[PDB]
Amino acid sequence: KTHVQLSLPVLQVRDVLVRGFGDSVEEVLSEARQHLKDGTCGLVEVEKGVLPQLEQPYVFIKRSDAAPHGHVMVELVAELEGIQYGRSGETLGVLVPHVGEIPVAYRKVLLRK
Numbered sequence: 001k002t003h004v005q006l007s008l009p010v011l012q013v014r015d016v017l018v019r020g021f022g023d024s025v026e027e028v029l030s031e032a033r034q035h036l037k038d039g040t041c042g043l044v045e046v047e048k049g050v051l052p053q054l055e056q057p058y059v060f061i062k063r064s065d066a067a068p069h070g071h072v073m074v075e076l077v078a079e080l081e082g083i084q085y086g087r088s089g090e091t092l093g094v095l096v097p098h099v100g101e102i103p104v105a106y107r108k109v110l111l112r113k
Contacts, residue, residue: 020055
C-alpha cells in the first residue's frame with residue numbers, strides 16, 4: 001500500500017527520552033520510516049522552544065493534501081541547519097522514537113509510504 005493509517009502518540013517534549021532518529025538526513029528519514037512501520041514513533045507538536053530541545057536532523061510530518069476516515073494525509077520532510085529535504089504543507093509535528101512515554105493525545109494520519 002502507498003499509504004498506511006497510523007495513530008501516532010503525541011508526547012510532551014520534556015518527556016521524550018530519545019530526542020532524534022540519528023545523525024544524517026538520510027538516516028533520520030530511514031529510521032523514522034522504520035519506527036512508523038513498527039509502531040514505535042511518537043509526535044511532538046512544534047511550539048516556541050520545542051525544536052531546540054530536540055536533536056537535528058529533525059523529521060517533520062507535513063500535510064500533503066486537504067482527510068480519509070479522520071486520518072490527515074502526511075509525508076516526511078527532514079531538516080538540518082535550516083535546509084529541508086522535501087517540500088510539503090503545514091507541519092503537524094516533529095517525529096521522535098517512542099520508548100514507552102505516556103502520550104497526551106493521538107494524531108490519526110495517513111502516511112505516504
